[PDB]
Design a protein around this ligand. Structure first.
Ligand SMILES: */C(C)=C\C(=O)c1ccc2cc(OC)ccc2c1
Length: 126
């Protein structure tokens, strides 16, 4: 009854494609109304399309954030998918780069219900 692996792959691919061009309005639509993006920093989770919109607006509004799909998009048949990305930007006045594993869980309507992210900071200074 949930989205097949192929659908998940396509959806996450499209998600990356939407992030690449900074289509925030389109991105927010891919999430469920009560979607949740858990924090990888031990903060309380983002919840609702409003907070998600604000989050993506904040982080993508600048345009100075690069995101590259490094690994292939994998997915099971439990409506869950995973992918490996590299994020590159600069906070304050210090260059920053990190590898990120995104895990997305889709609902029966094909929208993102729960999303998790796992970081691995890239060595740059030494
Ligand atoms: C990349 C430069 C940043 C993130 O991917 C990022 C930043 C902040 C949050 C907060 C949160 O819950 C408050 C969930 C995910 C992220 C992701």
């Amino acid at each position: 009854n949930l989205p097949t692996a192929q659908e998940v792959q396509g959806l996450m691919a499209r998600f990356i494609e939407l992030v690449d061009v900074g289509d925030i309005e389109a991105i927010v639509q891919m999430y469920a109304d009560d979607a949740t993006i858990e924090s990888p920093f031990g903060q309380p989770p983002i919840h609702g399309r409003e907070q998600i919109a604000a989050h993506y607006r904040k982080w993508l509004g600048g345009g100075k954030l690069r995101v590259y799909l490094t690994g292939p998009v994998r997915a099971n048949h439990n409506g869950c998918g995973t992918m490996l990305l590299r994020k590159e930007w600069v906070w304050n006045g210090q260059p920053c780069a990190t590898d990120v594993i995104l895990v997305m869980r889709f609902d029966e309507q094909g929208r993102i219900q729960t999303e998790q992210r796992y970081w691995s900071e890239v060595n740059l200074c030494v």
